[PDB]
């Protein structure tokens, strides 16, 4: 229709509400070919983010505002998480190939989004096709210990394993940084606390106040009851 359930196959597992209509087959074709060429070449947290982002890009959520059907673009925070953290390495490698006129063969009209041009999430009806990449997994959050690599460690440990004070995430001195982006919920009020918001390190970590130690893991005990 204008707003209707997703009628395709490739994104069946990722799309749960109404999506925008009016074409729809062209986006199914392209997404299917990209699943084979691009998605299947990705791994780990990048792959997880990319699948959700690709489906939300290709089949935007739809909602009614009075009599008008509204297409919801991607969210700034999800895009930031994907571009600057989860998929940064793969994203840079694609962009560098594009500079040499080497393109993903199956991209069709699809293009990597510019995160800065997208709405910031939140509002009973969302302004974007929110996927939640920056959110905490509540059951895995911990405070006095870490579950596994501590991706969702939210404690107040504020020195590295050798005792160096952490630099604040919201400051660019002594170490300048663009990743992890501060849209991750671990970092919104991250103070100078050890964090593993990207989930790629084996331990929570921080940039340190020592000019000669850009970043270092913190030393946090495993949670007694973590398996
Ligand atoms: C991605 O989008 C942002 C947001 O619009 C662009 O930032 C603008 O850049 C232009 C220069 O072309 C400036 O005149 C504007 O002041 C910027 N706007 C904002 C809101 O920051 C950015 O240039 C885009 N990135 C690319 C590579 O095109
Ligand atoms: C590693 C990047 C994974 C994609 C991240 C989410 C982006 C979804 C939009 C679809 C982009 C499809 C590839 C387009 C390639 C290009 O810009 O030339």
Curated annotation (Swiss-Prot):
Residues annotated as glycosylated: 114, 122, 127, 158
Spans within the Extracellular topological domain: 1-227
Compartment(s): Cell membrane
Disulphide linkage map: 3-62, 11-55, 46-87, 75-128, 79-115, 145-223, 166-206, 194-218
Tissue: Expressed in neural cell lineage from embryonic stage 11 onwards, resulting in expression in the brain and ventral nerve cord at the end of embryogenesis.
Role, per record: Tyrosine-protein kinase receptor that functions during early stages of neuronal development.
Family: Belongs to the protein kinase superfamily. Tyr protein kinase family. ROR subfamily.
Protein name: Tyrosine-protein kinase transmembrane receptor Ror2
UniProt gene name: Nrk
Parent sequence residues shown: 68 to 301 of 724
